[PDB]
């Protein structure tokens, strides 16, 4: 905590389930945002920090909480982005062990996201500190003294804080999206790498240049798309549609009607086909005639 280590996160397809996987991970709290949306969030210049905490004051480590470690060793701005993740590192850090010293002596509280890297004997008292440590003059660092016996308190708990930077540049850190399977030869709606459309998808004989990804017809409507996952070029055709027209001899001369399905094979859209769903179009037993 006295001298924490910073990291920069960029061009990252980041999944947060891997952190969820580890069982010693017991602190998933995020003061800033709900973890449910966390994976779907898109960010850039994400910055993370890690340190060694007794775990008794981990509540003080939360933003807006005050403690001697929060006073000197570590600082968290009250406004928070990301999550504070703490897991019990008693397996490793315990043994006691005195390497990871933490500073409990400094002139003033540190500003948000500020490093206190240099240790100078603390002149808490009025007398000058000249002459190394002395009365009212103490070394800032204190041994963390991780004895394995001390279980309830000051036990080894590893805490790491995630901080998210808010879209200063175009976002470069996001989660995995657009992951479902592929189907063909059916009236379906698709989102091909953000290209949202609806139609029957089929393989195409068209030839795309390597940088080409979609193709449009004369009317500038998307008529072919290259699959993102597979380099296959798939043709898109709109789902079958057309006008319906009704032939009647007149209400008073009978009530039977004849339905004309304009400009479509009888085969593609038989009585099986919804729009006018109560119309069963009678049945195939009823005479079906194909005209131009």
């Amino acid at each position, epitope marked *: 905590v006295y001298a924490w280590n910073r990291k920069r996160i960029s061009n990252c397809v980041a999944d947060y389930s891997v952190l969820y996987n580890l069982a010693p991970f017991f602190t998933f709290k995020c003061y800033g945002v709900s973890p449910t949306k966390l994976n779907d969030l898109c960010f850039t210049n994400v910055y993370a920090d890690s340190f060694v905490i007794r775990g008794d004051e981990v509540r003080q480590i939360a933003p807006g909480q005050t403690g001697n470690i929060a006073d000197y060793n570590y600082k968290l701005p009250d406004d928070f982005t990301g999550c504070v993740i703490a897991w019990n590192s*008693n*397996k*490793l850090d*315990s*043994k006691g*062990n*005195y390497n990871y010293l933490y500073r409990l002596f400094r002139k003033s509280n540190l500003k948000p996201f500020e490093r206190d890297i240099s240790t100078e004997i603390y002149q808490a008292g009025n007398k000058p500190c000249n002459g190394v440590a002395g009365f009212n003059c103490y070394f800032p660092l204190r041994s963390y003294s991780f004895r*394995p016996t001390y*279980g309830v308190g000051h036990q080894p708990y590893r805490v790491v804080v995630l901080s998210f930077e808010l879209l200063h540049a175009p976002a470069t850190v996001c989660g995995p999206k657009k992951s479902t399977n592929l189907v063909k030869n059916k009236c379906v709606n698709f989102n091909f790498n953000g290209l949202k459309g609806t139609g029957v998808l089929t393989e195409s004989n068209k030839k795309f240049l390597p940088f080409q990804q979609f193709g449009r017809d004369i009317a500038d409507t998307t008529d072919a798309v290259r699959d993102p996952q597979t380099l296959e070029i798939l043709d898109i055709t709109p789902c079958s549609f057309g006008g319906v027209s009704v032939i009647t001899p007149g209400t008073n001369t009978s009530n039977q009607v004849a339905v004309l399905y304009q400009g479509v094979n009888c085969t593609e859209v038989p009585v099986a086909i919804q729009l006018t769903p109560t119309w069963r179009v009678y049945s195939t037993g009823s005479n079906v005639f194909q005209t131009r």
Partner: antibody
Amino acid sequence: EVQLVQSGAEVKKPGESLKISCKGSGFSFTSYWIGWVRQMPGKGLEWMGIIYPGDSDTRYSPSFQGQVTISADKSISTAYLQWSSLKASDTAMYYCARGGYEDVFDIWGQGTMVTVSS
Amino acid sequence: EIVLTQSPGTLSLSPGGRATLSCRASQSVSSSYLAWYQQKPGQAPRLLIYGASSRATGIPDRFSGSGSGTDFTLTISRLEPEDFAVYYCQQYGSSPPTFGQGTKVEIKR
């Protein structure tokens, strides 16, 4: 107190498994990293590996990695080094001592003499 | 990896004197806090001094660790009769630890 009572010495021909049993007492088996150390007669000690009973996280010594099998049981708090089978060269003084990645001696067991001969 | 030569192999001196436990290392590892273990003949070794030079709990002050890097030394200011035993040095904070070859104490022959 915290003492690691080891199994008694054994004599056996090569080719059989020997689950040497080191019993630890006076401490939480989970809370502490245990481990094994081997000594050839007249040679310095060497590290065989360290096992974490809490997660059974067993880091074997690379030179002895896979050569022998080290295990333990939390319920009885006894180390169970299966040692795989037994080789004639494996006759040695094996101490079971509490130690971790920091490699502290903590408590050293009395040790067990394993003799492998015809 | 690090090979610890416990030079000299054997020390022959009068009781109560000081000695040098020169644990020469292949590479300089002071952060490893190399540990000296005292093994009595027919006894489980006892860590003489841990933390490079930190005093192991329940150890007489006549022992004193010192040195750094590739050269670590232990000086036993008052060589007591019980101190006549085998001494090892082992890398402490490093990757899979290796004990030294040993060092013995003697008076006459």
